[PDB]
Design a binder for this molecule. Structure first.
Ligand SMILES: Cc1ccnc2c1NC(=O)c1cccnc1N2C1CC1
Lengths: 527, 402
DNA sequence: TTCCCCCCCTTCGGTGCTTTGCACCGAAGGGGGGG
């Protein structure tokens, strides 16, 4: 109760609530006055005269502070993120405290009490403490409790205390008998500031249910996921299943959601049915089989090193585990986002590696050592040749298939004796019809009519015609930067089946060289 | 104190804080605990909504960590306090001096306090590992290192400190950009080093704690060159016509009509072509035309310079500084460990040269992933300033610079 | 009929060539754990 207040202001050109008379049913009007008299006894609310032109609507089930919440100054964000259990250090004893009337045990700013005017139909009063339901109250309470708790930790540093809103988790390596006397010291210290923490016999016992995790002193797990049972699923049912699987992936290894994420495409209606294909149902059954048994994480030990295995489940989906001792995961997860229309496995490995890098910086404060399924020379060639910049922090190869390898590679200089093609593609922009074909140096020629393909598509599949009508040693000349940019990146997957067929042709050939020449210069066969 | 006005009708700095390593957080905690005793920083409460990012770095051949605050949003908002109130005219002879030495005078900003109404705008937060505790917040009580208004207020003291020196040695050129001082002279290395040391002492007796040579004659924009083959082939000739066709836009005195005349019918790319003498003349004349500098390319203060970096491979990066496309103010190569480290050093060198030449850092276009850069750019950085960087999404398909 | 803090995926809007089709990217929807 004897706590320095926080000086609150208001935004420029703003005032307090101007709310007019509020109608209320008589039985509620008479009944609620007793609480208002009670609160005023200890001084939480104080009667005021007519100097206040502010009034607040009355609700019974509670005050509608929305007018103040909108017109009040902006504050600093109270919770920029919550811990992750994987990063928590292991404590021999852990205890939970809950301070009672916490939002009422911190005074309010003197100059701001005026704006919290509330009238019972009618007599008025103003809040002398942090009003509940207010926008800025949680931040002020957090600051106040930080100030209160600091001295105790200053004398005793062997304990660690965490403040989740009203809750105070206290952990230590002291013996149980000696830990209880420390928790009694904390209780006395919070009593000295007037905070209603419970007694010994009312304290909670492990595990603790926090933010969706069951926290034990020496392990942690996730809240049990009850998988929906729907023989006829819908949009909402699939969305809920996907959300719970994404949430549950952090401790259950190897969970696929992409097959089920596909079914949620292009459904404007909330209720319209979407049948589970063979693939989606098979994946769902496998996920149920995974979630059948319970698995637990462990607590970070800052005297040992961090290892982050990374496996590939196929189809652009990656799983990873993080541990310190073998077979004891600190954390698990998956990376499955597709970025861009065209990419290959090495680039997705790179994106996964940097994802885990950022998450491990946030949670553990340091980058782990990757054990990647890629050959050293493969990665070396890729980063030396690629046009961007990238650097995987530290990694070693793991001989656990499936591995990563670029399925093909182009040639740098034209091949002697290799058959040479001069391709082109055009399409009528108005009618979406066109032609595509090539003129080989030896004399072979071929042209194809085309419909429902744009200029880019026809220029891209002229390469397909050339590859079809070729041998193994081929020198294609293109008059298109778009197709050149698509092919030159070594893609091994795409959202275009045309490019899929092109890639399938390109993997077959032993040596393919492709070159580009300008348009409208009439160069050789092009014209 | 000197009152500071924000650009009218704008908000304040509301920027999230990037996660940091354990080492760079222990460094920040120690540095800020030591700074609070001197009264430079002041712990603040929940009534302050603003924030600017904070990192820790190391200097050249230095072990002590150094705090570094990103003030780019604050500068974009407070550039009214500079453009109107102090526009320093950039010396022109700085580009030619034999040696320019760069010195750090940021500590001299700690003496002069900051406007009390403005302080709330410079709030920052040291976060915690795993969000275990609420990050400890602070505010500047004296002028910070990183703001564009900090040197503008201190102009008088530095002029007063440097005038007893400028009177004696009128040949040297002294320029100030942010926390950094560029002193340029034509002396030889042995005399120049001792001159810079005694100059540091002149400031030290004035009460400045001041703790590196770029040769501006070497900083000359590079020429462009046509490829030379004693033996010409169809693939080699086709490549040249495209390279020249690209070159036509940037230098419009380049012609490829006769050069393309040989290439008229399908021919194996590998086959050799005897080169005709008339075409040989266009090739011979064109190589010389490339050497001739472009006309109309003069620095304009109204716009902002944009810098492109292209990885050419094997440690080589090529960059171009252009106010508008196809009109390059400068052009060069950087040759060099790592690959993000190479791009970091390239960015630093390009912007140091740009500060020397035109007096302002460019807008960088980086050939790197946004997330990899934002994770690792702070690990090899060693400069108190920070430019404005964007990132590119498509390969450099032309790539006709090296 | 609240404020939203993160995790994930899809849909969609703006930008910039690779130019009136197409390439990434961030900003709207939902789900999950929240208080
Ligand atoms: C929710 C939470 C957040 C941060 N730390 C903890 C907790 N709660 C715990 O119950 C806990 C469990 C195991 C280890 N540390 C824990 N504690 C720590 C303080 C002793």
């Amino acid at each position: 109760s004897p706590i320095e207040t926080v000086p609150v202001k208001l935004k420029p050109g703003m005032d307090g609530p101007k709310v007019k008379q509020w109608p209320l049913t008589e039985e509620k009007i008479k009944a609620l006055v007793e609480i208002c008299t009670e609160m005023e006894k200890e001084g939480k609310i104080s009667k005021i005269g007519p100097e206040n032109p502010y009034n607040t609507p009355v609700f019974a089930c509670l005050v509608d502070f929305r007018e103040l919440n909108k017109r009040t100054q902006d504050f600093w964000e109270v919770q920029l993120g919550i811990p992750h259990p994987a990063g928590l250090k292991k404590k021999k004893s852990v205890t939970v405290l809950d301070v009672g009337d916490a939002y009422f045990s911190v005074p309010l700013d003197e100059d701001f009490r005026k704006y919290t005017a509330f009238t019972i139909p009618g007599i008025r009063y103003q809040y002398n403490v942090l009003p509940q339901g207010w926008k800025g109250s949680p931040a002020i309470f957090q600051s106040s409790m930080t100030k209160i708790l600091e001295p105790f930790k200053k004398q005793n540093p062997d304990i660690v205390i965490y403040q989740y809103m009203d809750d105070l988790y206290v952990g230590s390596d002291l013996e149980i008998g000696q830990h209880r006397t420390k928790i009694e010291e904390l209780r006395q210290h919070l009593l000295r500031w007037g905070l209603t923490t419970p007694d010994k016999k009312h304290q909670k016992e492990p595990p603790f249910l926090w933010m969706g995790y069951e926290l034990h002193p020496d392990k942690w797990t996730v809240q049990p996921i009850v998988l929906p049972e729907k023989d006829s699923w819908t949009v909402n049912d699939i969305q809920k299943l996907v959300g719970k699987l994404n949430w549950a992936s952090q401790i259950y290894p190897g969970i696929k959601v992409r097959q089920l994420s596909k079914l949620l495409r292009g459904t404007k209606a909330l209720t319209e049915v979407i049948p589970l294909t063979e693939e989606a149902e098979l994946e769902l059954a496998e996920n149920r089989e995974i979630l059948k048994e319970p698995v637990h994480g462990v607590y970070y030990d800052p005297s040992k090193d961090l290892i982050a295995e990374i496996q590939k489940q196929g189809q652009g989906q990656w799983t990873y585990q993080i541990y310190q001792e073998p077979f004891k995961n600190l954390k698990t997860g998956k990376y499955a986002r597709m970025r861009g229309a065209h990419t290959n496995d090495v680039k997705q490995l790179t994106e996964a590696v940097q994802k885990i890098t950022t998450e491990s910086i946030v949670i553990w404060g340091k980058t782990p050592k990757f054990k990647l399924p890629i050959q050293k020379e493969t990665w070396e060639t890729w980063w030396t040749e690629y046009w961007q910049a990238t650097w995987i922090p530290e990694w070693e190869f793991v001989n656990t298939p499936p591995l990563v390898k670029l399925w093909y590679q182009l040639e740098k200089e034209p091949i002697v004796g290799a058959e040479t093609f001069y391709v082109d593609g055009a399409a009528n922009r108005e009618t979406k019809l066109g032609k595509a074909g090539y003129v080989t140096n030896k004399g072979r020629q071929k042209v194809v009519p085309l419909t429902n393909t744009t200029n880019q598509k026809t220029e891209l599949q002229a390469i397909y015609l050339a590859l079809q009508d070729s041998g193994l040693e081929v020198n294609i000349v293109t008059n298109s930067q778009y197709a050149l940019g698509i092919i030159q990146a070594q893609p091994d997957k795409s959202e275009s089946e045309l490019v899929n067929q092109i890639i399938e042709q390109l993997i077959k050939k032993e040596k393919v060289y492709l070159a580009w020449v300008p348009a409208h210069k009439g160069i050789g066969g092009n014209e | 104190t000197v009152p500071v006005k924000l650009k009218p009708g704008m908000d304040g700095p509301k920027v999230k804080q990037w996660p940091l390593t354990e080492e760079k957080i222990k460094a920040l905690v120690e540095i800020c605990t030591e700074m609070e005793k001197e009264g430079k920083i002041s712990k603040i409460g929940p009534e302050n909504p603003y924030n600017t990012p904070v990192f820790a770095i190391k200097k050249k051949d230095s072990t002590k960590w150094r705090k570094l605050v990103d003030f780019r949003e604050l500068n974009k908002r407070t550039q009214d306090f500079w453009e109107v109130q102090l526009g320093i005219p950039h010396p022109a002879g700085l580009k030619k001096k034999k040696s320019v030495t760069v010195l750090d005078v940021g500590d001299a900003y700690f003496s002069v306090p900051l406007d009390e109404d403005f302080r709330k705008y410079t709030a920052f937060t040291i976060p915690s590992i795993n969000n275990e505790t609420p990050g400890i917040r602070y505010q500047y009580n004296v002028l910070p290192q990183g703001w564009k208004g900090s040197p503008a207020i201190f102009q008088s003291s530095m002029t007063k400190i440097l005038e007893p020196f400028k009177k004696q040695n009128p040949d040297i050129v002294i320029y100030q950009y942010m926390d950094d001082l560029y002193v340029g002279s034509d002396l030889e290395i042995g005399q120049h080093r001792t001159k810079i040391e005694e100059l540091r002492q002149h400031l030290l007796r004035w009460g400045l704690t001041t703790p590196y040579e770029l040769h501006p004659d070497k900083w000359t924009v590079q020429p462009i060159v046509l490829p030379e083959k004693d033996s010409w082939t169809v693939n080699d000739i086709q490549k040249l016509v495209g390279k020249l066709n690209w070159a036509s836009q940037i230098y419009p005195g380049i012609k490829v009509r006769q050069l393309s005349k040989l290439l008229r019918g399908t021919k194996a790319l590998t086959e050799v072509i005897p080169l005709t003498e008339e075409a040989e003349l266009e090739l011979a004349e064109n190589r010389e035309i490339l050497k001739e500098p472009v006309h109309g390319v003069y620095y304009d203060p109204s716009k902002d310079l944009i810098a492109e970096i292209q990885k050419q491979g094997q440690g080589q990066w090529t960059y171009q500084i252009y106010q508008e496309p196809f009109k390059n103010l400068k052009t060069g190569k950087y040759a060099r460990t790592n690959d993000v480290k190479q791009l970091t050093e390239a960015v630093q060198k390009i912007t140091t040269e740009s500060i020397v030449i035109w007096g302002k850092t460019p807008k960088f276009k980086l050939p790197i992933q946004k997330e990899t850069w934002e994770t690792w750019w702070t690990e090899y950085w060693q400069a108190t300033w920070i430019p404005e960087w964007e990132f590119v999404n498509t390969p450099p398909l032309v790539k006709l610079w090296y």
